[PDB]
Amino acid sequence: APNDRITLPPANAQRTNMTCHFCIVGCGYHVYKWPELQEGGRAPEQNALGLDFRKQLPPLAVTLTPAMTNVVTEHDGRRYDIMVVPDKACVVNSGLSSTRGGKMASYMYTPTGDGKQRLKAPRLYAADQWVDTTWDHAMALYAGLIKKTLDKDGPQGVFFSCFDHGGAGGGFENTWGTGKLMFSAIQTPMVRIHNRPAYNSECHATREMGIGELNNAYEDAQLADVIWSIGNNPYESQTNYFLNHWLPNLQGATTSKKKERFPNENFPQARIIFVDPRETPSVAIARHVAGNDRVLHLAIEPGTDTALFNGLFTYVVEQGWIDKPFIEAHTKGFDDAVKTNRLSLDECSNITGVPVDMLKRAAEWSYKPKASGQAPRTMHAYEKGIIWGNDNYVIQSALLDLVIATHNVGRRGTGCVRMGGHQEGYTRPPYPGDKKIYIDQELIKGKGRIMTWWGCNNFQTSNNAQALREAILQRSAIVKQAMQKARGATTEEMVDVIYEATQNGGLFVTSINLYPTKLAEAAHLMLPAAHPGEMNLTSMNGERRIRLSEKFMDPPGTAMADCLIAARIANALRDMYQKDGKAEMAAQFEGFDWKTEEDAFNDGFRRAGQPGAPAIDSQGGSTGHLVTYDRLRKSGNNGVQLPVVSWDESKGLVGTEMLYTEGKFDTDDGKAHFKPAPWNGLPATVQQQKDKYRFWLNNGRNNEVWQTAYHDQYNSLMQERYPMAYIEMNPDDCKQLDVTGGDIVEVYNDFGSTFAMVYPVAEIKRGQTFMLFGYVNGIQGDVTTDWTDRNIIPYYKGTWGDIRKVGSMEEFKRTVSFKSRRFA
Amino acid sequence: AGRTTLQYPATQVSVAKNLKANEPVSFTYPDTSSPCVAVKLGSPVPGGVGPNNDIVAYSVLCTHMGFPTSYDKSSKTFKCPGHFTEFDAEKAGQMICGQATENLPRVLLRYDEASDALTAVGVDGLIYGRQANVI
Amino acid sequence: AGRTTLQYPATQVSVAKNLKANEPVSFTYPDTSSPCVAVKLGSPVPGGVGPNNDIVAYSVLCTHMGFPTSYDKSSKTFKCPGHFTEFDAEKAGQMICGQATENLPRVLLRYDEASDALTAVGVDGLIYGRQANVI
Numbered sequence A: 001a002p003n004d005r006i007t008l009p010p011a012n013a014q015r016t017n018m019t020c021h022f023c024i025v026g027c028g029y030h031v032y033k034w035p036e037l038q039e040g041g042r043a044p045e046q047n048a049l050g051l052d053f054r055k056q057l058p059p060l061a062v063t064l065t066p067a068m069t070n071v072v073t074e075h076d077g078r079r080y081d082i083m084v085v086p087d088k089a090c091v092v093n094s095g096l097s098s099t100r101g102g103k104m105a106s107y108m109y110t111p112t113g114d115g116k117q118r119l120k121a122p123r124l125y126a127a128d129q130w131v132d133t134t135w136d137h138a139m140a141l142y143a144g145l146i147k148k149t150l151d152k153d154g155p156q157g158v159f160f161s162c163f164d165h166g167g168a169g170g171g172f173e174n175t176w177g178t179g180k181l182m183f184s185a186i187q188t189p190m191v192r193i194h195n196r197p198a199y200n201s202e203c204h205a206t207r208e209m210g211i212g213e214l215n216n217a218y219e220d221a222q223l224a225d226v227i228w229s230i231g232n233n234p235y236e237s238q239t240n241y242f243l244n245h246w247l248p249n250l251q252g253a254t255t256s257k258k259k260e261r262f263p264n265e266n267f268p269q270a271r272i273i274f275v276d277p278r279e280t281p282s283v284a285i286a287r288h289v290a291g292n293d294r295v296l297h298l299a300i301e302p303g304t305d306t307a308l309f310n311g312l313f314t315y316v317v318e319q320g321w322i323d324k325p326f327i328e329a330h331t332k333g334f335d336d337a338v339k340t341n342r343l344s345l346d347e348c349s350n351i352t353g354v355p356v357d358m359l360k361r362a363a364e365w366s367y368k369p370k371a372s373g374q375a376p377r378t379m380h381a382y383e384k385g386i387i388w389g390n391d392n393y394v395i396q397s398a399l400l401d402l403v404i405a406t407h408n409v410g411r412r413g414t415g416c417v418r419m420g421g422h423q424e425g426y427t428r429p430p431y432p433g434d435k436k437i438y439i440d441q442e443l444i445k446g447k448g449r450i451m452t453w454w455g456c457n458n459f460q461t462s463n464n465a466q467a468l469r470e471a472i473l474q475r476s477a478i479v480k481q482a483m484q485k486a487r488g489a490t491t492e493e494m495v496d497v498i499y500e501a502t503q504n505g506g507l508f509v510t511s512i513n514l515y516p517t518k519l520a521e522a523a524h525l526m527l528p529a530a531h532p533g534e535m536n537l538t539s540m541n542g543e544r545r546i547r548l549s550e551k552f553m554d555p556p557g558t559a560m561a562d563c564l565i566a567a568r569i570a571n572a573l574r575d576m577y578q579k580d581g582k583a584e585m586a587a588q589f590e591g592f593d594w595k596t597e598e599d600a601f602n603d604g605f606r607r608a609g610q611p612g613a614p615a616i617d618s619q620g621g622s623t624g625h626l627v628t629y630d631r632l633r634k635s636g637n638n639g640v641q642l643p644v645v646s647w648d649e650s651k652g653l654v655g656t657e658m659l660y661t662e663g664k665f666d667t668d669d670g671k672a673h674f675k676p677a678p679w680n681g682l683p684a685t686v687q688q689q690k691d692k693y694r695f696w697l698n699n700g701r702n703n704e705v706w707q708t709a710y711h712d713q714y715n716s717l718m719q720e721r722y723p724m725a726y727i728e729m730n731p732d733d734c735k736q737l738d739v740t741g742g743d744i745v746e747v748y749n750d751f752g753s754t755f756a757m758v759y760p761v762a763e764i765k766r767g768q769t770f771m772l773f774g775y776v777n778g779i780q781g782d783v784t785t786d787w788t789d790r791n792i793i794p795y796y797k798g799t800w801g802d803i804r805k806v807g808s809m810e811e812f813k814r815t816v817s818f819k820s821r822r823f824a
Numbered sequence B, C: 001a002g003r004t005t006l007q008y009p010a011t012q013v014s015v016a017k018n019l020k021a022n023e024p025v026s027f028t029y030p031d032t033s034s035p036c037v038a039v040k041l042g043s044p045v046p047g048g049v050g051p052n053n054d055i056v057a058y059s060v061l062c063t064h065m066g067f068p069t070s071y072d073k074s075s076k077t078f079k080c081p082g083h084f085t086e087f088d089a090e091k092a093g094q095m096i097c098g099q100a101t102e103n104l105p106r107v108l109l110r111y112d113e114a115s116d117a118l119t120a121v122g123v124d125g126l127i128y129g130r131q132a133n134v135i
Ligand SMILES: Nc1nc2c(c(=O)[nH]1)N[C@H]1C(S)=C(S)[C@@H](COP(=O)(O)OP(=O)(O)OC[C@H]3O[C@@H](n4cnc5c(=O)[nH]c(N)nc54)[C@H](O)[C@@H]3O)O[C@H]1N2
Pocket: A168, A169, A170, A194, A195, A384, A388, A421, A422, A454, A455, A456, A457, A458, A461, A462, A463, A512, A513, A514, A515, A517, A529, A530, A531, A532, A562, A699, A700, A706, A707, A708, A709, A710, A773, A774, A780, A781, A784, A796, A797
């Protein structure tokens, strides 16, 4: 309650390790837990922080606020203070906390806090009202429907959209549990991923070219001469990688270390290049830190990345700023790529809009040999501006070509890497189908009997989201109406009622989640899940560093770890089949005899590539068995970078810093493969929107807001600052539409209609906008198209629309700052 | 015992009419290790004090990791050089963008019409680097 | 002056094995004007202590308007003669029916296996008729 003090952890308070729940960087934290009616003393040796609160602390001594504290009430009814604070000795973050990780304590479950509306028990929409139901009933209904569908339609009738990521709502236990359930037991191919509408990858091209997307260390960002940030706003989206590794390089604090590693190499002041249509907070901050002369913002025309990289590739080849020995010994296809990808600087400039002098300068900084003879160490970092860009596959083809020719993989201070989104934590059986299926289109077209959203919310985050919602709400309603007729039915009769409604266009919808979410508008069944700290969980960050987040409290009510929900489902289905005398079907549901999450770790990550093991695709590789919970605990928040190379009791886990340092790539022949990258303009579907409507509807992240705001929607500070999704608009465009900060606009096109509050931004180009994605009040995705690349990767950043004033929200004008988020 | 509130001192800052529009005054509260600013904004804001209800005051220590922020007269914000947090002086220290999880703490001023005095009497929010606002 | 917690005493009640199933013991905590009961319930409950995790203790002052409640052995509840509030000894003082807005406060017991001792070390909830549990 009181805003002007905090309770210090006692010197002997319990302390556990926790990786941040949220973004890829995976900053390390400590959780202090102690009884509510104890506290630490201000003297440094009388509190667990070892800090002297008897007088003012200096800058950088601590990160501690009330938002980093809480009081939990456990299953035994006893109350405990918690404090969740960053670990000063963690190599990832060196004691830094983002505004998002900083709120972890506040977003732990408590009966009266921000977590108050956590799912605590199964919820059933019994035709015309939400009620609680038992887990046994829920499993009878859910497994009963799956069983009926398997028995009559086979697996093709059972649909999922499921996380494949790490951190909270993911990780190695959870991805294995769900993957084993969906792929080995049920054996359904009707599965999409949390952020993309098929069972596919963000990185098909780079992987096929032999370069897995997480190939370096965070230390490489400290060793680089030049950093490219491509389709990426890292201060906001990978905060502490940018703050703890990128900025020290720009500031000159890593120059010593470069020169120590490389005695005979010049290291100029580091420089940074951003390829982004939009001038972001990251551009502004880079210029404040390094100066204007060390930052190059290539403010390309939306969707022109391929043309940019083809023009750069062409130029470095014509200048001879490539590594010919490297290409000759370790690559295939270079000569072909030179021809297919040829594009002059003048043509490049005309397509991208970037002037020729700036294209040449980027190449000069990045690829022209240093005075000491070596090529610059240029780390090429990319994210969703090109992963959700104009033809995912082709852009990566174009970029990786430039990288391979310039030998910017496998050398320290280089890498062509994803910056990442969530943390990573994938261990799954192979996908069981032989084709890519656009799951959302299939649902819209009326296929499937049961759909489970598991740790995602595509109502807010699908492409073409309005078409999806329309269809799902309708299909859901058919089931609701069918259930309505029933009175006094057994569970088995209800299963039959619902099954029949699905033959008539219906769809049974389950959500497995922390919260009701907007999915509750269509769901029939919701199951409560547990997040890290309420469970043990393993995951890795953007340099493959695996850590254990330790359990320290109980979940709300009967919430359960997702891997144990998957075991519960499997065991229900098994029992049903055993009882029906179907031994062969029963046996498909074996191998879920799990009592704790660690069981799922042992069954999945730790079996990969082992004798007698089934086929398992794991980020841990075949040395995953060397990792145990205990060994991770002893490693601390530093963990180990995967893959593990050895272990013994005296040296602990020893891992891998950088990939591809010996020139052996993940292809048949061990070489890196160049690929053609044709420039075909924008897709027709997108070009049609652009031809009809005025504004480029760019979209993405805000620093303060995490994802679909599942926690933030309950946070009064978050809600005061961002009550509605906002749209950055050019002020001249604003005046033309007679809107200002805190007005509400409709944004629309052929695909849909949504709303935002207007946020005038001087740095936005005329005819361009930027709307917060994924949010709880004004869903941006309504106006994204259905267009996807060859692998069903959406162009989420590729849509145009018109904007119409709704009116002036005086309350937003009184409460919300519309001041500039670009620091100068 | 019996006491749930902190024992804040009452410190005179200045008289309101000495303050010029958008020209910050520096002072310490609630002790000499806690730097603060008062500023007359020039137009009324919620909870502003003085004759034009436009005077506001803050702890200038960033609530992220405690560097002293600087007041920017062009934007009426406090900017942190540490990790680029920026706070809105016209929105009770609302974080515009940054890495803090707390708004910039407001120093509560009494304005006495009788004397024209502005007195610091408390703090809304927790000042960086402290177990309690009053050490 | 740094302190956010109350200064509760540590008061020995008895040894656990002296307590008989469903036979309440009376004691005072945290001072002689605060009557309390401890009882061995006979079956484990959440947060119960002792060898069989079934010992619980409460303030007996009704949290409505402060009459001393009486323990009813047949139902394992505390009943208030004032306006008929009844609290569940098996559900951490949950009000079954009545006019209070707060559960019966639990006296927090440490049980030491080495000595078999039950010591009252704090109070969860606010005792009737007090500004703070510790006067
Ligand atoms: N227009 C547009 N759309 C986009 C994007 C874009 O750039 N533009 N970005 C895309 C990208 S990169 C992504 S990652 C997706 C995100 O789309 P989603 O995955 O749909 O969104 P999240 O908010 O990550 O969803 C996480 C959900 O899981 C729940 N949850 C949290 N922890 C747990 C857990 O332990 N267990 C379970 N079972 N549930 C849990 C939360 O309550 C929440 O409902 O959006 C995509 N959509």
